[PDB]
RNA sequence: UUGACCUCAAAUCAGGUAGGAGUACCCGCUGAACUUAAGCAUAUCAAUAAGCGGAGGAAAAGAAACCAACCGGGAUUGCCUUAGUAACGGCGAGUGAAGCGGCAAAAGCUCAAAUUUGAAAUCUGGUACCUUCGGUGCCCGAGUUGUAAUUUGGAGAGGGCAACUUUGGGGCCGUUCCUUGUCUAUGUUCCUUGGAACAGGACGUCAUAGAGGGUGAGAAUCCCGUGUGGCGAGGAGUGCGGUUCUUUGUAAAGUGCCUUCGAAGAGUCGAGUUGUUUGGGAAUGCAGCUCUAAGUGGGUGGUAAAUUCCAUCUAAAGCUAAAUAUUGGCGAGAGACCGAUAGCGAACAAGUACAGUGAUGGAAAGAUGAAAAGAACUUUGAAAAGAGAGUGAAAAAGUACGUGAAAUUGUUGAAAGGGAAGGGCAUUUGAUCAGACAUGGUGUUUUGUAUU
RNA sequence: GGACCAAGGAGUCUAACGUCUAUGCGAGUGUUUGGGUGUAAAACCCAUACGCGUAAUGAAAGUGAACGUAGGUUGGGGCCUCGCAAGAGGUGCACAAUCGACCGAUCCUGAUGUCUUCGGAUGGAUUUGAGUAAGAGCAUAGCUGUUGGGACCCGAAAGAU
RNA sequence: CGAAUUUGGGUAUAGGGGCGAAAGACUAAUCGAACCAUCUAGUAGCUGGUUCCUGCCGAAGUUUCCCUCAGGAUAGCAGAA
RNA sequence: UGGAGGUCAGUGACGAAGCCUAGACCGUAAGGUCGGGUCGAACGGCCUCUAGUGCAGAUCUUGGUGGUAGUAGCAAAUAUUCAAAUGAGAACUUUGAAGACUGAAGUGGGGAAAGGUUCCACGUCAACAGCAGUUGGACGUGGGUUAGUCGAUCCUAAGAGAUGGGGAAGCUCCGUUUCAAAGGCCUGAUUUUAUGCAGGCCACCAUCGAAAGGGAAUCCGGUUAAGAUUCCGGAACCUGGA
RNA sequence: UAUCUAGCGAAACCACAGCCAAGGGAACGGGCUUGGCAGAAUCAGCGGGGAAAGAAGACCCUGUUGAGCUUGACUCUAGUU
RNA sequence: GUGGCCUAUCGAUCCUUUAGUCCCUCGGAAUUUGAGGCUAGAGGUGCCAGAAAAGUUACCACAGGGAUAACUGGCUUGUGG
């Protein structure tokens, strides 16, 4: 069972795993079917861009909050600021997300500008007009790319004022670590006469 | 060099379809070519074979032998022509069947349907 | 390729390389890690000491995104700035134009001081910095400002 | 998966003067009392049955694929390698063979064969024609009835009737410079496919594969560099630089003393 | 006793509906043991097999009582990854998810809880008519113990101020979808072998067609098809381009400012305990039992508890395409698969013959020939048949049929043989058999005078 | 065990891996979940992300790798200077032994300052790490070996629905 | 050998169950737990077998631990690089 | 050795593959090449790829075949013989003559279960009847089973089992008159109709379960190759209706 | 009956086979060694031998293989209280 | 002088418990209980590298073993003669 110097391997194969084996022979066929579905749907919605307009959103965790990605839909605050109602926005092709809240001024501004330029670029055919055939483009995502916002210039002046940036980190961690103890001590010193 | 997806280049499927085809398909299968003079007269290359078509065996051991069609055996994929038979040792003559692709049609049995077929295939009557 | 295997070479010989006395039986030692305390204890103790038991604390619902913190050393620091600009900055090694390096944008959490950056000034935007890393940047004449 | 196992066979055990293999039960059939469930048994399951999750496709490094493609393209130009691959290019003026873009715009199969005649690869295509032959196995009834050689590989930039014109010509393959498969640039892993480029194909090749002055438009890619600067190590060995520093030679065959 | 109402029945009352099958995939219930642990009881196998109930073309899930702790994401599903990780585990054997991220697909929503109260505005059915998946009248009936309109937390309602913006129904040609039909090139020219030319050789032709199949042997050009276009037929038909009448409607919907409100699901949440389950660990989900709430309340925030906060959702009600699954059904295209002891058990009158009371079990079995041309006729025999003849390219293809191996057998021939035979080394004996010429030619006394 | 003969008949494939070897690139590497394209399961192209690697150590909080020419000593292939002819000297990569230095853990010491008990400088210790000390890895493929799988083939007495 | 008799048909009892004037007897030639299918290719440290040629190298039955004694791990002996 | 990419513009109906051959050559060998015969449609060399890739064994699997071996054997139930006919052929068939046996709890005449056409005729002998066969329960072709009275059908027995109800996640289990609002009898009425009725008596709680139990009624004579309490002739009987 | 004949016609078993003595040998040989010897084809009997055939010894032991049964074994459980 | 003059006098993982750090953690932020860790002992496996474990089978079964008993034979000849 156990043998020469080898790593301990944990191979979870003592169920009837052979009955649940999925081999993806249909990878190429599924890709072809997906492209066909995109083509036929685009033909069905022929003047429309085959996808919706998504907002700029900041990725949640401390591992990813350095990056900006696509959201689910624009907030109701964002659509109001862009100057249109949520229902009409949904009809003319903006993804509206009701449960997302904007606490962020620059994400607010970036999404409002996204909406403003979207309204500038698209043209809506009137219900009973003359249908100005308009050479459909097939990707709102590619037409309005998500751009990571630049933070500061490449070269700026050096400002040193003598904190070493390590003592500040240590002291911040220590203050967090001992805040409750110090508050309790202040409480006891106040309450004892 | 097939280009459609509904056309199969499968030997098994093609052979099965050939051997299993019903009489309506066996007619088109047993289409036979026309003579030089008949091609000149009609403008049409090959036609499904019929019963009173005059034909010329132009391949095989009965090379260059004329006759009138006696019966197209769609079940046996053959055509039996008048006066092309075999003499058995007991003295009875048995029809020899032959494939219409090895034939040349020298005279057609015409009617309204055959004339409409010639016209539809491009013939001039 | 099957044609390259030793089964093809054992074709002809009775036991197929498995021995006459001790045959190739099914599971003469157990299945898997059987008997790690009893009859494979010698292998376990020689080759995998520390196998049996538990030592530390537990951590229910541990998230690896909390502990995401790749480390950048000073020697690799200068590779964060674009290569064509590198000679430019090295030659124009001076204050009031130092390049700001966003290690967090590059994908690093902490700056460690593996040592010997040139004595040019440079702005190191980090969110964690080692004592020696900050000391060496200050010695070079740059500064590290902390970000989040 | 159920082949060889659709039986209720049980071993008779020992003491019945028969082997201990499973045997099917019942009676009055002829199948009854017969062995089952074994690779050694007629009607049993095959040893280690072939399974659908065997590896079929094999991953290859992108850069290694491109290295091999570049080697095949380079071997195209070598006259000796094309002859060794057997492409009947002796009456061709010179290779790598190049034609105008009028070929690129050719529209008829008659015109394609005429251009092939003109450039001198008709010998290759009629070699394919005369090499058409019936297969030598059970691959005949698996939709692989006939075999024939490979002809020239016409490589273009724009398709204005090339694939249609040369579609019916036996053996002749068409490709554009962008793709340039290894499977057709070195059929059978034998280098030296006979390639009839167009002028646009050459001009695009210089930019698609990069050079000493132009990047290859494949991202992060560059043409592989040799481990040896030349190919005539005989020339290197016999150069005066090497030959002036070496001790006097022997005789190429030692005298058999004693 | 003029009659109701409620509750409960009866009708071969009027009209419907359910059951069974298939069950590959899907939704639940129920639920093992073999096996692993080198023994075995927790564990594992496995929340699997077997059993049961219920769907569809997908099902389920689904628009947060979610994830998070961030500079916050934002219905569900699936993939790559997280990750063989956090964690569970006689902490042994083993087991083992999720958040973030990148993608495929993306779609949103509606009920209860509000007085229409200046008019139950709602709906089934009967009857009548019509342009009949329905529409319109009248009549009972249902319903106030509540059917319409309006609102669903993202909000919203009521009341004021205030410019505005947008709509409509049913046909008809078409587009589009499904099915289907028809038309749309090129040699059977000459020679040799052959029973057959589809083989070889000569000369062609077409090619957006040299895929495949058939035809008496390997056929682009003999046939069907193939390729490229064209022309027809039957239905579905607001995905949309035109058109028909249809103005109705001081009708319907959206937005700006302010005020007052803002109903939001109970034997339920939650707690204890029990069993089961989970990676879930002072207890992850589920279920039984006991207790059983509240309204800045309630849930969650992966260590039990009490005190402060904070963050995030808003259960105990409901619908919803796509990505996703599919060893079943139907229609197709393929393969470095198998090639009649193989491949499905079955290439065949195969789930057949046969066996068992029964549940069930379950084979063997493909090939004459291009064409039966399947052997007329004679002779011997009671016949079966034989011997001739005959057909066939072949009868060394005769249905007991392609080739026709081995074991085993007959005949003939050769040889050996005193309780085996077979074998090695060596020769003899018999039988049998391969291997060097005359090739360049100095000599040339010689033909068809550079032909030996 | 084998009367005899014919046909069939037994170390396989997969998921994770160890050593070695070949190849590509190289502090990076890996296109092939997916997108684009296509003569259509092919070939060709693309990009964030993600995986492994580039940092370790600790149960964890956490901290986190140069007195020095990235050190001294011994030994070192090769190279350099020298001798027509002796042999010596310099430099010494890989690698091996040894003494050090650096980072983390443990035990001690405890500076200026002090949200007066936080901070932890400095100096140590027969202690300890799967570390640093001018990266070597990633990917594909091949034999061999391992583990779970029917697992080289055939074989129970049994157990369950 | 006139009965606690023999027997036809109908009927009841079904598998850890039945039935037994009791032998673990009988329960369709199957009983100290029937038969059928499936789990299941159940596990086996134990028997048997394990398919071509040549070339080079070439063992061990010993050490330690193990519910260890017909088995493993470990070191040794061996090959290869 | 099977298959795959390439190549030999490879071999081949003027003979591919396969197979037989004490014929030759090559290789230490695995094997490869060739001559001769048979055969009739495909196959090979080289560079690579791939695997369901090599058999003497496994009481191996399937099929086939031996020696044993013309061997053991075809010896229970007393037993056969003569002649003729039939026929190619007779120990075995048919007819006659003998001799026997079962011996009325039979080797007879019928039936039940079971079988399923074996019944009967004609024709016929390949296989079967462990010898034979002209015979047959065999093979081929046909023909044949007639009911008011015989039996089923009806009744209920042991028992089986819906409904009403209760249980069970459920397949289904219990229950058979239960805690149910459980229906089918008997004369006429209006008799411009329908049996809606100024009518009345009542309440037993499905159904299945016997070809031997219970029970309405048929006998004789004749008739066929094969049916007869069934057909025919005669003579009756029972039930229901009028 | 066996036996002989006409007809019909199996099976078990079978590595190859079938003369001994002694030796040695897995310690009881048909084969090997040394001797004795040794003549076709056979028929009926016969039971010394073939350690004859029948069956993966049922006795015994081993296995970290079971099952039937028992109990103050270990761990549970229907029911009951 | 780091227990007994020397050579024997003894014990893993998991769990519990104690002692020390009063140090680390309970992961939305705190305090106090509670729990979890770090280092060293103790509670013990005498089958002593450490399973939690009663019988019977003359009703029995399977995988094997001549590794192993009950016959012969073989070697020995104490004992018997």
Curated annotation (Swiss-Prot), chain A:
GO terms for cellular component: cytosol; cytosolic large ribosomal subunit. InterPro entries: Ribosomal_eL13, Ribosomal_eL13_CS. PROSITE patterns: RIBOSOMAL_L13E. Keywords: Cytoplasm, Phosphoprotein, Ribonucleoprotein, Ribosomal protein. GO terms for molecular function: RNA binding; structural constituent of ribosome. Component of the ribosome, a large ribonucleoprotein complex responsible for the synthesis of proteins in the cell. The small ribosomal subunit (SSU) binds messenger RNAs (mRNAs) and translates the encoded message by selecting cognate aminoacyl-transfer RNA (tRNA) molecules. The large subunit (LSU) contains the ribosomal catalytic site termed the peptidyl transferase center (PTC), which catalyzes the formation of peptide bonds, thereby polymerizing the amino acids delivered by tRNAs into a polypeptide chain. PANTHER family: 60S RIBOSOMAL PROTEIN L13, LARGE RIBOSOMAL SUBUNIT PROTEIN EL13. This is Large ribosomal subunit protein eL13A. It comes from Saccharomyces cerevisiae (strain ATCC 204508 / S288c) (Baker's yeast).
Swiss-Prot record, chain B:
Keywords: Cytoplasm, Ribonucleoprotein, Ribosomal protein. It is found in: Cytoplasm. Coiled coil: none annotated. Belongs to the universal ribosomal protein uL24 family. NCBIfam families: rplX_A_E. There are 2 genes for uL24 in yeast. Component of the large ribosomal subunit (LSU). Mature yeast ribosomes consist of a small (40S) and a large (60S) subunit. The 40S small subunit contains 1 molecule of ribosomal RNA (18S rRNA) and 33 different proteins (encoded by 57 genes). The large 60S subunit contains 3 rRNA molecules (25S, 5.8S and 5S rRNA) and 46 different proteins (encoded by 81 genes). This is Large ribosomal subunit protein uL24A. The lineage of its organism: Eukaryota, Fungi, Dikarya, Ascomycota, Saccharomycotina.
From Swiss-Prot, chain C:
InterPro entries: Ribosomal_uL15, Ribosomal_uL15/eL18, Ribosomal_uL15/eL18_sf, Ribosomal_uL15_CS. The keyword Cell membrane does not apply. Residues 1-38 are annotated as: Disordered. Residues 1-13, 20-29 have a biased composition (Basic residues). SUPFAM superfamilies: Ribosomal proteins L15p and L18e. Keywords: Cytoplasm, Isopeptide bond, Ribonucleoprotein, Ribosomal protein, Ubl conjugation. One of its GO terms (cellular component) is nucleus. Gene3D superfamilies: 3.100.10.10. It is found in: Cytoplasm. There is a cross-link at residue 95 (Glycyl lysine isopeptide (Lys-Gly) (interchain with G-Cter in ubiquitin)). GO terms for biological process: cytoplasmic translation. The keyword Ubl conjugation applies. Its main location: cytoplasm. A motif (Nuclear localization signal) lies at residues 6-12, 23-29. GO terms for molecular function: RNA binding; structural constituent of ribosome. It holds the Pfam family Ribosomal_L27A. Belongs to the universal ribosomal protein uL15 family. PANTHER family: 60S RIBOSOMAL PROTEIN L27A, LARGE RIBOSOMAL SUBUNIT PROTEIN UL15. Component of the large ribosomal subunit (LSU). Mature yeast ribosomes consist of a small (40S) and a large (60S) subunit. The 40S small subunit contains 1 molecule of ribosomal RNA (18S rRNA) and 33 different proteins (encoded by 57 genes). The large 60S subunit contains 3 rRNA molecules (25S, 5.8S and 5S rRNA) and 46 different proteins (encoded by 81 genes). HAMAP family: Ribosomal_uL15. This is Large ribosomal subunit protein uL15. It comes from Saccharomyces cerevisiae (strain ATCC 204508 / S288c).
UniProtKB/Swiss-Prot annotation, chain D:
Its main location: cytoplasm. Changing residue 237 to A: Leads to an inefficient release from ACL4 with a delayed assembly into the 60S subunit. It comes from the Eukaryota. One of its GO terms (cellular component) is cytosolic large ribosomal subunit. N-terminally acetylated by acetyltransferase NatA. Changing residue 42 to E: Leads to a slower growth at higher temperatures but allows RPL4 assembly into the 60S subunit. The modification Omega-N-methylarginine is found at residue 42. It is found in: Cytoplasm; Nucleus. Changing residue 45 to E: Leads to a slower growth at higher temperatures but allows RPL4 assembly into the 60S subunit. One of its GO terms (biological process) is cytoplasmic translation. Keywords: Acetylation, Cytoplasm, Methylation, Nucleus, Ribonucleoprotein, Ribosomal protein, RNA-binding. GO terms for molecular function: RNA binding; structural constituent of ribosome. Belongs to the universal ribosomal protein uL4 family. Component of the ribosome, a large ribonucleoprotein complex responsible for the synthesis of proteins in the cell. The small ribosomal subunit (SSU) binds messenger RNAs (mRNAs) and translates the encoded message by selecting cognate aminoacyl-transfer RNA (tRNA) molecules. The large subunit (LSU) contains the ribosomal catalytic site termed the peptidyl transferase center (PTC), which catalyzes the formation of peptide bonds, thereby polymerizing the amino acids delivered by tRNAs into a polypeptide chain. There are 2 genes for uL4 in yeast. This is Large ribosomal subunit protein uL4A. The chain holds residues 54 to 311 of 362 of the full protein.
